Write a protein that binds this ligand. Structure first.
Ligand SMILES: Nc1nc2c(ncn2[C@@H]2O[C@H](COP(=O)(O)OP(=O)(O)NP(=O)(O)O)[C@@H](O)[C@H]2O)c(=O)[nH]1
Ligand SMILES: Nc1nc2c(ncn2[C@@H]2O[C@H](COP(=O)(O)OP(=O)(O)NP(=O)(O)O)[C@@H](O)[C@H]2O)c(=O)[nH]1
Ligand SMILES: [Mg+2]
Ligand SMILES: [Mg+2]
Lengths: 175, 41, 155, 37, 175, 162
């Protein structure tokens, strides 16, 4: 049926071109686009999942990766209980900026917002600029879940959302 | 081709600029009231 | 300037229409013989033939940065040279980092780049590029290997 | 330099196709958004 | 002092780009004219209430870019249309025939159509003798008027007229 | 090859930007006197000298109006083959009105007169301006275009719509 027990808003954030839009398309409608252009405006798509017997409806919001600033970040982060902070394994700069995004979250979004670091375009193995060890390490010390995904070959895209959603579930469950 | 190279990109980048400022403003309003609009589906 | 060799152009245009990763098709055979094999030829041949397999299979990966063959920051594993190695190669599931010279890195990524573009076409996945644009990308990809083949590389 | 005008005209194509789609939706649900005054 | 209304009429502005639709709108709603005004992006509407036969009529005036090629949504629910041309550009008048086709295709029948009639303030530049149009108006079942958003002439009258004619048609079907 | 460029005559610009800051329709100011002698008067020089200066009065008052005439009694007023301002016989597709009687006019005459009317219209837009988003520089170059047009009509170079 269409009923759900929880509705979680999760936002995708990160440098332009790291693949946010395709993580969205892969998870919500299992589609990938190699040629996709930059995202205009703001969107979200939904998918429901089973977590601990209860039905969880995920509301995945996506927006233009070009930020540090304009005009609508306040609304975008509002009500977000989860955030997928995404970088390009093959472009080191996008990892470099990960700290700036954590700042972005620490300013305009609620605390207690579950943050997961991804971890994306793992399918390019000869181009890797960000050794997994360093990323996993950065994540743990900064209180983040961590995973590596490929929207292109589908690896961990599923696991990635399943993870952030069940961890958001538990925090909402305890209280 | 001459000096007409800089006049085509000058007016067309300024149009894009206004186009984008419009898109931001309505999106804000859309989010401020009925954000259901911005769903893909 | 640049002008398409009709001979190659027709060969490709046909291959794009019925893509195969088969090493033996006319499209790929030519490139293997002329570009790929020579590019993946190294002094230490055991590791070399393993690399070739990893590239074809996409199990090879290249990262920036107590085993003997692995080489080290001052010594390349593929070619016996002593040069500062800023990158390390890892073959599939193997968990071993082999240090690779900047010269080697160029040769391998050149080949890995050709294969990953070809794969994109075979499962294409390339919808917005004209057949002509796609062709000249392959030429570009081949040009790189042709230079790496001969020791002309970029760092 | 002449390749710049081909791509920024392609941006208008993309920006405007966006505004249209969004406008259609806005009217299909809450057109109050589109009021000026 | 009322703020409430008896009737709500939606009127659309159509015609070639640059005939002065947006200024007809601004002149009617906020009595403003802009000589340097740029092309209208997206879709807008502004509202004004007027008194007709003791009853308050709330007019919803919609405006958009005259160059067209979202039309269905635009004409929908429209009970009135201001089909606008530039007195000084014969070409925008030639295209009045083209606009009626879009009108009688995508909009409800019974829709009141008024022909305008604009930039009457340029006296030395007139390309469209009043009669040629006024005749075209009567023979195709259109009201007709000439306005200048620039000097204010007939702009008010134009709206007052098409609105009362819409009132008259809806009251009488009610009888 | 030779390219078409533009540079302001400092004399005309300073004369103008001074006028712009305190606009007047007064015929005798520095700005308009030059423009009247060099552009307006020569444009409105015609055979029928009584009627010609009469049109000028209509133009200054914006009471002049021009309609086309898809194809009473007097030597005046003209007809489809004969112009009222100049006695020449040509097909007149336009008709002039000085105030609420029609005078027939040749296409050459029309260009000269409208060219003037456009100048007055922009000059008036500026007094009651009404000119907001245009910097003074653009306004200046607008005035030059207006002058170029009158200067061309002055010499017999005109435009026809067909
Ligand atoms: N190899 C590979 N390419 C990917 C992957 N995900 C996305 N890409 C590619 O890299 C680009 C990423 O596009 P996109 O997903 O739109 O990124 P984005 O985060 O939406 N950028 P923006 O914020 O500006 O819209 C696309 O060309 C896409 O084909 C991935 O997992 N692997
Ligand atoms: N002389 C004169 N100019 C006018 C009049 N009304 C509008 N204009 C001018 O005509 C130009 C176009 O006006 P505008 O209202 O923007 O036209 P539009 O119909 O909105 N264009 P679009 O349909 O693309 O938005 C502007 O320069 C405006 O000042 C008028 O009554 N008289
Ligand atoms: Mg995106
Ligand atoms: Mg408009």
């Amino acid at each position: 049926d269409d009923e759900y027990d929880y509705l979680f808003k999760v936002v995708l954030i990160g440098d332009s071109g790291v693949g946010k839009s395709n993580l969205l398309s892969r998870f919500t409608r299992n589609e990938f686009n190699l040629e996709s252009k930059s995202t205009i405006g703001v969107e979200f798509a939904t998918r429901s999942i089973q977590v601990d017997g209860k039905t969880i409806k995920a509301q995945i919001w996506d927006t233009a990766g070009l930020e540090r600033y304009r005009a609508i970040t306040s609304a975008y982060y509002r009500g977000a209980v989860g955030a997928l902070l995404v970088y390009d394994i093959a472009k080191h700069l996008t990892y470099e900026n990960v700290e700036r995004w954590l700042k972005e979250l620490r300013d305009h979004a609620d605390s207690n917002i579950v943050i997961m670091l991804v971890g994306n375009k793992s399918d390019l193995r000869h181009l890797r600029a960000v050794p997994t060890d360093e990323a996993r390490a950065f994540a743990e010390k900064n209180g983040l879940s961590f995973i590596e995904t490929s929207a292109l070959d589908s690896t961990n895209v599923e696991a990635a959302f399943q993870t952030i959603l069940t961890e958001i579930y538990r925090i909402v469950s305890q209280k | 081709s001459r000096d007409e190279l800089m006049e085509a990109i000058q007016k067309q980048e300024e149009i894009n600029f206004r186009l984008q400022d419009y898109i931001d403003r309505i999106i804000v309003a859309i989010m401020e009231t009925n954000p259901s609009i911005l769903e893909v589906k | 300037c640049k002008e398409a060799d009709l001979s190659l152009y027709n060969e490709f245009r046909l291959w794009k229409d019925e893509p195969t990763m088969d090493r033996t098709c006319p499209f790929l055979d030519k490139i293997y013989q002329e570009d790929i094999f020579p590019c993946l030829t190294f002094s230490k041949s055991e590791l070399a033939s393993a690399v070739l397999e990893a590239v074809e299979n996409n199990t090879l990966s290249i990262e920036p940065v107590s085993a003997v063959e692995c080489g080290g920051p001052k010594k390349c594993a593929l070619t016996g040279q002593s040069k500062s190695c800023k990158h390390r190669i890892k073959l599939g599931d193997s968990s071993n980092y082999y240090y690779i010279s900047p010269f080697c890195r160029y040769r391998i990524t050149s080949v890995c780049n050709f294969f990953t573009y070809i794969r994109y076409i075979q499962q294409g996945l390339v919808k917005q590029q004209d057949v002509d644009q796609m062709f000249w990308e392959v030429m570009q990809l081949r040009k790189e290997m042709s230079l790496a083949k001969l020791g002309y590389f970029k760092e």
